[model samples]
Target: MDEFEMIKRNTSEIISEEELREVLKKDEKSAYIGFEPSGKIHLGHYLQIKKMIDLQNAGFDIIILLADLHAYLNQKGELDEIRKIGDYNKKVFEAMGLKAKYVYGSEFQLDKDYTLNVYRLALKTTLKRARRSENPKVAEVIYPIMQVNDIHYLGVDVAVGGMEQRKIHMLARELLPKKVVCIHNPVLTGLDGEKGNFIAVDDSPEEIRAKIKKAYCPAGVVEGNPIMEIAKYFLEYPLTIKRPEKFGGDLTVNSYEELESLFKNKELHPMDLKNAVAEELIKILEPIRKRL
Candidate 1:
């Protein structure tokens, strides 16, 4: 596939495809995304990580910010504790085959130059919009400002983030002197059909199976089905599902469309689909687990 097509895969939106195309033409282009340290590095995080890999494969230098300071500012925990989580998050990302220049928010966030940019951004940003950007303890208000500055300070040509980060990405687009292409990824639903739940990258095979077994995939229903969502995002093409001949023998699902259509028509049982997804997920994470 072409570099443009590779970078565009699975992405929900890209601000100005023309700009992205230009960036691809550059000899030395860079893309960045930030993550606040957390306990579990689930598939939601993996979805964005996969995009970073895509960018890397497309010949862009990848910068992954382990946003320890952002987590601390958000009152997640002590700075040291947040950094610890940040360190682990970096390893998980690497295990997933993302080659990046890993950076911590604390590394340069306190520099005189970076701080000045934050203050300048704060002045231009409205109180109402900053508040809407979400954060508290004065840290909350400055959160979006710092995030926008992250783009400029890092000197990245493109900013990659989940859809939730669109507000801040848009703020960066408005505040920065130069345009930064923003790529937004689709968010994943929880295994139970809710927004916040997920299957961690390090989850054991048994755990993966159990989660999918109890996932919110209703027969003949495609909307809001977390199982289908995972299948679409995580599974590789030409997936083979092994089952007994009694249930129509072993089946090979060549694409998401085929699987979706089969399930939509009730030709595929929920268990069969769940089993395939669970096993495929395990196989996908196997290499990552070896790294751990």
Candidate 2:
């Protein structure tokens, strides 16, 4: 694949493809993505990390913000505990083969310049606009302002995140001094087929198998099917599905396109697809688990 293909693969949207093309023309560029350090580093996080890797290979400096301070403002936990989680999160990202310059939110968020800038941004940001970013919590209002500040302070040429971040990314682009191309990946469905369910990157082989086994996957239906989504986004191409001879022998799916067509045509069974996803997930996550 070319530079554009690698970056565009599996992403839900690029704020502007024209802007992305422009950014790619430059020889020196940097991109950033931040996490709140409040939950398990699941497949969702890996998807973003993978996008960063894509950017890295395409010659961009990658910055990962382990946002402990963001977690604190959001009332996830004490700063002390949150920082620990940030550290663990860093290791996990590395284990996933992400080579990034990791920065903790506390490391510089409290700087006078940074805090003053937050206050400056606050002046221009109305309560209504801020509240649109999250809940009724006062801290929630502050969360997005800081998030926008993160992009400004980091001075990234590109911003990467999931579709959930579109609001803030939009806000940031409007608020930032210059342009930033925001790449948004699709949010993965949880194993239970719920909106927020996900498999952690460090889930043990047994846990992975168990979760995928219970995952929601309806036959002949591709839309919103968690299993199909997982297989499409997470697995590499030319996937090999092993099966007993009675099940029409093993199947080699050369691409997500093929896999989807086969499954939708009823040529592929849900159990067979689930089994392939489970084993493939185990293999993909095994090294990360070992590192932890």
Candidate 3:
């Protein structure tokens, strides 16, 4: 299978085949993924960046939107200097070797006529869907209209963002004149293993490993453990429980199902599962960690 196909298999839970095929078919066209910089980017952000890089490698033009307006409003004017922080985020992406074009909403110069088009789209979307969005309050209510406008203004053929932004993307689909493909990135878990606050790019290797080792991984809930999801998404290592020879029943399993079986049968405890996940996660994130 090709690189994009491999990514599709690994991320099937997050992206459908139709979306993957469309992304792959746009080899000659430009695509975009926006990041609303709320704070310093973490390992979770790196994973998404890697996905973008993979798309770039597959020969698609990329647009990296630095959502400064969204950040400023969400932070309750705490980060009033949005451009400064946005530039810093650009440097972060550059450091990670991303070559996408950078655009900021705060810097865009548009006519009143164009601004009205965005407002019209915003009015089309219901407040209920906006409230259910994973975006910050301002983002869900107001920023989505701006994001949709960016697509209309830039004339991008496709857009990419986390699954959390699906609502906005759907709204854009309904409002925009042209058909814009939306790629939904998986909602990766954080270092604490839940979903909030994650490990940053500057985290020490030991800290990364330790955090993964203590991550939450309940049975039949691979989605809960961000560390495990990272491992499954990126690692080529054999995910097996290595029992010593002293244990008469020295068992070894590779597939997730086998690992799950061991856990359910009481042969492997949660800690053992976490350790195995950490080992695999470290192996996968090691290269990116080194690069950063």
Best by lDDT: 1
Misplaced by over 4 Å in model 3 are 12-27, 76-81, 95-97, 109-113, 122-140, 190-197, 219-223, 239-243, 247-268, 290-292
| TM-score attained by model 1 | 0.93
Task: Give the Å error, residue 175, model 1.
Answer: 1.2
Model 1: how large is the Cα RMSD against the reference? Answer: 2.1
Of the pair 2 and 3, which is ahead by TM-score?
2
- TM-score rank order: 1, 2, 3
TM-score of each: 0.93, 0.92, 0.76
Q: Report the lDDT tens digits of candidate 3 across residue range 1-292.
A: 4856644443324334575567567536777877776456776677677777776777777888777666665663444577776777777677777888887756662458667876787777777755645445454476667777888887876676677778777766777777676666677776665434566665666876676666666664555666456555555545455555665344566666665556566667666566666665666555545654
Model 2, residue 260: displacement in angstroms? Answer: 0.7
Q: What C-alpha lDDT values do all the predictions have?
A: 0.87, 0.87, 0.65
- Which candidate's TM-score is highest? 1
In candidate 1, list every pair of residues with a backbone clash: 135-140, 136-140
